[PDB]
Amino acid sequence: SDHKFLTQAVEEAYKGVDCGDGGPFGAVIVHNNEVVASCHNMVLKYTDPTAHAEVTAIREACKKLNKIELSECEIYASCEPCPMCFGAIHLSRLKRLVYGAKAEAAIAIGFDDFIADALRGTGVYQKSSLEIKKADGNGAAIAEQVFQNTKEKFRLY
Amino acid sequence: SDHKFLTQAVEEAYKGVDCGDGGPFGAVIVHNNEVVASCHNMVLKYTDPTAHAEVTAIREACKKLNKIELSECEIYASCEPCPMCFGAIHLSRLKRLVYGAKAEAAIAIGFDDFIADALRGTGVYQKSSLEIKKADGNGAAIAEQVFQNTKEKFRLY
Ligand SMILES: Nc1ncnc2c1ncn2[C@@H]1O[C@H](CO)[C@@H](O)[C@H]1O
Ligand SMILES: Nc1ncnc2c1ncn2[C@@H]1O[C@H](CO)[C@@H](O)[C@H]1O
Ligand SMILES: [Zn+2]
Ligand SMILES: [Zn+2]
């Protein structure tokens, strides 16, 4: 079931960049194989630098489920979450994170060098414990290729 | 001018607790010496765990200025910004952060141990550029007192 929802997140990334909402990033929040939220980056559409795909998905999932904790939910991100988005995932109490592409694939097309220490386990003060899965194989290749595929379709931010 | 805006952020923390919007946290974003945003934690009001005071102030300031970058603005936080909030401050490109109380003051009254390595200078993958000032003396006393004064007047989250 991981492949299906990572796929959906990647397609959200493509859709968001095509409609000009924001960058090529998508996020799907799922509750026991029920899609609670399906979102992409909305920084340009919302004039909001915090409206990454993961944060937008968290906001919509929490509003839909009428609670601020998503402890029985899981989040699929097309890209390895940034420090802000990983902090948001922590605060949301999401129990599992699956992500598609390494941050380096997004950095390679000119995005900021902005990587979450707590995700990679390189912090002194911030330590994470939530289950984290980096996809491999098919979905990982597709998720990594998103950035080369969308390079000329949007302005960097 | 720092003490005035830090005190306004602390005041926002008190207001947000009093009307039940969220926890005892405030944030004020100013452009030179004009307040562009004045906010407190809105997690309970919005059913949004990302609605910390700093994130809320960033979103409202970006709406007021009609742009996604705040490089000419500074932010005053009643409490040391969390990993999510410090990451949002990085993305928003605010040029200066002044914060009131160390995170340990909020941990002492029941909030999670959730500290930003990049703020304290122990980050490996996240390196910040912005000027950071920890208040001392009266501003620190006020910001720290926030937590003793409100310690059981709000619902923890
Ligand atoms: N919705 C988004 N989701 C993930 N990363 C994003 C997003 N928007 C911009 N980025 C940037 O992509 C890079 C790789 O994570 C970082 O510089 C980060 O700020
Ligand atoms: N609006 C807020 N602003 C800053 N810290 C907050 C806020 N709400 C909750 N906290 C928590 O306070 C603690 C100290 O930073 C952390 O656990 C953090 O998540
Ligand atoms: Zn992010
Ligand atoms: Zn925060």
Residue A102 backbone zone (phi > 0: left; psi -120 to 50: alpha; other: beta): beta
B90, B114, B117 member nearest A124 (Cβ): B117
Reported as half-sphere exposure (CB side, CA atoms, 13 A), residue B69 has a value of 6
A48, A62, A115 member nearest B59 (Cβ): A48
Instruction: Provide the token pair at A90.
Output: 């922590």
Alpha helix locations (H) across chain B? 2-18, 43-46, 53-65, 83-92, 103-107, 117-120, 137-149
The experimental technique used to determine this model is X-ray
Check the CA dihedral B61-B62-B67-B71 and report its sign: positive
Exposed e or buried b for every residue in B44-77, given b needs 16+ CB within 10 A? Answer: bebbbbbbbbbbbbbbbbbeebeebebeebbbbb
From residue B86, alpha-carbon distances to A18, A103, B40, B91 in Å are 30, 19, 16, 9
Residue A152 appears among annotated catalytic residues? no
Q: How far is C-alpha B47 from the chain's CA centre?
A: 19
* End-to-end alpha carbon distance in chain A: 32
The residue behind tokens 């906001």 is: A59
Quoted resolution (Å): 2.3
Q: Which atom of ligand 1 is nearest to the CA of B91?
A: 19
Cβ(A109)–Cβ(A148) under 8 Å? yes
d(CA B107, CA A90): 16
Instruction: Provide the token pair at A72.
Output: 């029985």
8 Å CB contact of A123 and B117 = yes
Distance from CA of B155 to the nearest CA of A (A): 12
> Taking an 8 Å Cβ-Cβ cutoff, which residues of chain B contact chain A?
43-44, 46-50, 52, 55, 58-59, 62-63, 66-69, 82-88, 90-93, 114-118, 120, 122-126, 157
Question: What is the residue type of A34?
Answer: E
CATH class of the domain comprising A1-150: alpha beta
Distance from CA of A74 to the nearest CA of B (A): 15
Reported as half-sphere exposure (CB side, CA atoms, 13 A), residue B103 has a value of 17
Cβ(A71)–Cβ(A57) under 8 Å? no
Q: What angle do CA B85, B157, B3 make, to 5 degrees?
A: 45
For residue A103, what is the nearest residue in chain B, using CA coordinates?
B125
Cβ(A154)–Cβ(A21) under 8 Å? no
